[PDB]
């Protein structure tokens, strides 16, 4: 009845591993230059990942590697207070809708048990359409985020600088040394396919080491 | 700083968390379905101090319990084509509408311009949807605190309170999961959903599911 995971994204290879083979194409290795661990570490933890329903291996086999699918595509929500700990998985798919989010005029004062009781539960059915909202922009992000990967290769040709493009539509931020760290190349060949990059996506250097997608461009 | 998957992807960790957010409400740290070393849970409890999830208190005349330090939300996704999570810091609600505009976004655009402007059109949506999140968290965690402390001075019955607590963050409970949380017998918790019945509106449907009666809740 389930896959863990908070377990497989509780070690940090693991999270490193994934955010590589998330983009196949992108990367020489599934590891960042930093991230620095053994194989059979490394395999140790793939097979985790096989076991537990996450990843998927395949033997990419000719005549005269193995290879690894993600095998979830899967949404989480969860809170951590000194009143309440919940979760819930959200199953990715599919419908565009324009959610509205009441929360103005939920009760501030409740003066009665009865009140507060009502209150909460009303309060669950905005967040049962937050929850419902969060579903359809994931599913929708996913499925583009396929189009621009195949888009960028075809329109472009350079894995690396896809590479990039898909952090920071995911991350809004990176300096950099992270992007340094996570592609396994040096500062120098990031800053010049960041200004290789910028020749077709509106991309910008703030602070003198921090790379962001320049939004004001990109809406108008 | 705190990792809260590491914390998370154990199971003992889970049931002792749910049970120290309600900590007045229960008896015991743990379910009773779980067999687990008294030593194993001390261990536990350290890892989550250490990580600063919790923090502990000694107390004299020695006794130890423990508080969590954290106020947070989470948000993550695992597609073949991303993975990214985002911690939300919880607090001081500020309540107001929020527009989430969906529709189109276009199903079939053409340019990897037009594909670009288009994800970056859905992450502004995203940041509404999350801050929302943010929103309704920080609301219903101040409103549980309220709850728990209504509960307390109005009518005192902790064990009444658990199941309650347990039915507004999880729609429903069995007998015998509420039976497995409490460390109580399935009479017990059957005595304690009919004496609660009569301050909250609480229906036992199929003999054997607890459910809020939402219909009398909200009409």
């Given at each position: 009845m389930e896959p863990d995971l908070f377990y497989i994204l509780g070690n940090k290879v693991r999270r490193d591993l994934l955010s590589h083979l998330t983009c196949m194409e992108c990367?020489?290795?599934?590891?960042?230059?930093?991230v620095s661990v053994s194989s059979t570490a490394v395999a140790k933890h793939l097979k985790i990942m096989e076991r537990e329903g996450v990843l998927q291996s395949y033997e990419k086999e000719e005549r005269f590697k193995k290879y690894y699918k993600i095998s979830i595509a899967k949404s989480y929500v969860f809170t951590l207070t000194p009143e309440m700990f919940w979760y819930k998985g959200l199953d990715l798919g599919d419908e565009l809708r324009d959610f509205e989010?009441?929360?103005?005029?939920?009760?501030?004062?409740?003066?009665?048990l009865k009140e507060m009781i009502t209150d909460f539960i009303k309060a669950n059915k905005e967040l049962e359409k937050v929850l419902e909202a969060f579903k359809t922009i994931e599913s929708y992000r996913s499925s583009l985020m396929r189009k621009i990967k195949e888009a960028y290769l075809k329109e472009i040709g350079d894995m690396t600088q896809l590479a990039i493009l898909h952090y920071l539509l995911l991350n809004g931020r990176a300096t950099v040394e992270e992007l340094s760290d996570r592609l396994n190349l040096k500062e120098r060949e990031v800053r010049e396919k960041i200004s290789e990059m910028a020749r077709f996506v509106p991309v910008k250097i703030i602070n003198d080491n921090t790379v962001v997608l320049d939004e004001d461009q990109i809406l108008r």
């Amino acid at each position: 009845m389930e896959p863990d995971l908070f377990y497989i994204l509780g070690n940090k290879v693991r999270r490193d591993l994934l955010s590589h083979l998330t983009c196949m194409e992108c990367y020489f290795s599934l590891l960042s230059s930093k991230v620095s661990v053994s194989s059979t570490a490394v395999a140790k933890h793939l097979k985790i990942m096989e076991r537990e329903g996450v990843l998927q291996s395949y033997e990419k086999e000719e005549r005269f590697k193995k290879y690894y699918k993600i095998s979830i595509a899967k949404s989480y929500v969860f809170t951590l207070t000194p009143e309440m700990f919940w979760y819930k998985g959200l199953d990715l798919g599919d419908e565009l809708r324009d959610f509205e989010i009441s929360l103005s005029g939920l009760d501030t004062e409740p003066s009665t048990l009865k009140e507060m009781i009502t209150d909460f539960i009303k309060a669950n059915k905005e967040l049962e359409k937050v929850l419902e909202a969060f579903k359809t922009i994931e599913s929708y992000r996913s499925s583009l985020m396929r189009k621009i990967k195949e888009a960028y290769l075809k329109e472009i040709g350079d894995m690396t600088q896809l590479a990039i493009l898909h952090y920071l539509l995911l991350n809004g931020r990176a300096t950099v040394e992270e992007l340094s760290d996570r592609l396994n190349l040096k500062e120098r060949e990031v800053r010049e396919k960041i200004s290789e990059m910028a020749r077709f996506v509106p991309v910008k250097i703030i602070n003198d080491n921090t790379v962001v997608l320049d939004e004001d461009q990109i809406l108008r």
